[PDB]
Design a protein around this nucleic acid. Structure first.
Ligand SMILES: [Mg+2]
Ligand SMILES: [Zn+2]
Ligand SMILES: [Zn+2]
Length: 395
DNA sequence: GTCGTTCGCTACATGTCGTCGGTCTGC
DNA sequence: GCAGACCGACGACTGTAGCGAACGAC
């Protein structure tokens, strides 16, 4: 069976997140967005474990279910060098063992969602492999809290340790990640690290797996690509829409080239901000080979349907008209990805014409995209001739 | 016209811990 | 005067009350 899953979210116990980020709301929004599997997130926090045991029903010893949505134990943690690490746990016993094992190395493990572990990345990965915990550098291209903002390679970060995946993130896709030779030997994950259960937030990037049943073991086999199970698709946000694609300032958000960045010494001239190196320039710095493996699954660059509706209606992202249109679209059809890629333009025009034309322009890549960097998301704008024209004379 | 309804932009939070300037000290 | 110790502020890790102001069925 084919299942879509987003295995990287943060509960309300994390900081700068939404208080509506609870199990029922997440399950409802995922079921409405056509999302089969959702990672628990913040599984190291005991209060979140209590809420999970209260609101959900167990499938086995590591897979749970609520409102028809499956859940696997996941958690993002922080490093002593301030590096994000995503972990997937087989069962709840592994969760409790890993928790009690690091209580002496942390002070907010029973207080925060993404906590602070005073341990080397090598030590964390070794402890994870000891208990067969899946571990990977989450959004490892961010110039703030990632791996490549601190280290230059995975071997220098983990040493004698072994990882199980590598989360790409918003500002990256499979090609630029595969531009590094070592990355050829590691499966990718297109996750969200999302904080709000909003349409454009929850499940902005997910992974489509082929499995036999919906359990942790099948997900592990699909990640490792064994026994017929495999990660057959990586649905992700366009890198130009991420918050740190290009190199820009952290205050004025002015885009600067890598050459101009080195010239100004990371000092913003007309602002004074601390310009941070985008993921594109970082990947270009760590350029290995122009080749990429064949077994790499395809990465479909998609945009949030909510933002498309907002830019078509000329209204905000959180407005009520765009919410009504999004709800009507999700009622008439299946999920966001269906209307974005799979659904034909003529069927989309049955609900709204301008939205169908914008989706056509996005599929044919005639949609204007201004990249984002330094903390600002990329923006999308449709040309005038695409909006004023009909549909038959379009293609 | 009328007054509920909604839009879009500004401000602000919850805390841990680095980075980044500025300041004190003891020489 | 200056190296080193000390200090404060600043923001990610974004989401959202909230607040005038334009809006839209009667
Ligand atoms: Mg992406
Ligand atoms: Zn993170
Ligand atoms: Zn600046």
């Amino acid at each position: 069976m084919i299942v879509d899953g987003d295995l990287h979210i943060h509960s309300h116990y994390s900081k700068a997140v939404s208080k509506l980020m609870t199990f029922p709301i997440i399950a409802e929004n995922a079921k409405l967005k056509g999302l089969n599997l959702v990672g628990t997130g913040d599984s190291l926090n005991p209060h979140w474990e209590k809420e999970l045991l209260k609101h959900s029903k167990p499938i086995d010893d590591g897979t749970f279910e609520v409102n028809g949505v499956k859940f696997i134990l996941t958690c993002e943690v922080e490093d002593k060098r301030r590096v994000h690490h995503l972990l997937i746990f087989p069962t709840l016993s592994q969760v409790r063992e890993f928790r009690e094992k690091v209580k002496i190395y942390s002070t907010n493990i029973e207080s925060e969602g993404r906590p602070n572990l005073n341990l080397t990345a090598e030590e964390i990965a070794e402890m994870a492999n000891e208990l067969d915990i899946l571990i990977g550098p989450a959004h490892a291209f961010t110039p703030w809290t990632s791996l490549y903002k601190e280290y230059d390679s995975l071997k220098d970060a983990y040493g004698d340790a072994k990882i199980d995946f590598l989360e790409l993130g918003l500002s990256a896709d499979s090609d630029m990640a595969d531009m590094i030779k070592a990355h050829h030997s590691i499966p990718y994950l297109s996750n969200s690290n999302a904080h709000s259960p909003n349409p454009h937030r929850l499940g902005r990037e997910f992974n489509r797996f082929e499995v036999k049943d919906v359990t942790f073991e099948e997900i592990r086999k699909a990640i490792k690509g064994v026994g017929g199970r495999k990660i057959m698709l990586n649905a992700g946000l366009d890198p130009r829409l991420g918050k740190y694609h290009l190199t820009a300032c952290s205050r004025c958000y002015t885009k600067y080239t890598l050459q101009d960045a080195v010239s100004l010494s990371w000092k913003c001239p007309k602002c004074g901000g601390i310009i941070k190196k985008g993921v594109r320039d970082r990947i270009l710095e760590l350029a290995d080979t122009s080749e990429k493996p064949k077994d790499r699954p395809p990465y479909v660059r998609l945009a949030p349907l909510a933002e498309i509706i907002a830019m078509v209606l000329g209204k905000g992202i959180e407005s009520k008209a765009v919410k009504l249109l999004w709800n009507r679209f999700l009622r008439e059809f299946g999920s966001e990805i269906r209307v974005l890629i799979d659904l034909p333009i003529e069927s989309i025009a049955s609900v709204h014409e301008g939205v169908a034309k914008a989706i056509w322009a996005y599929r044919n890549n005639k949609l204007i995209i201004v990249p984002g960097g330094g903390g600002k998301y990329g923006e999308i704008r449709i040309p005038e001739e695409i909006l004023k024209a009909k549909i038959e004379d379009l293609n």
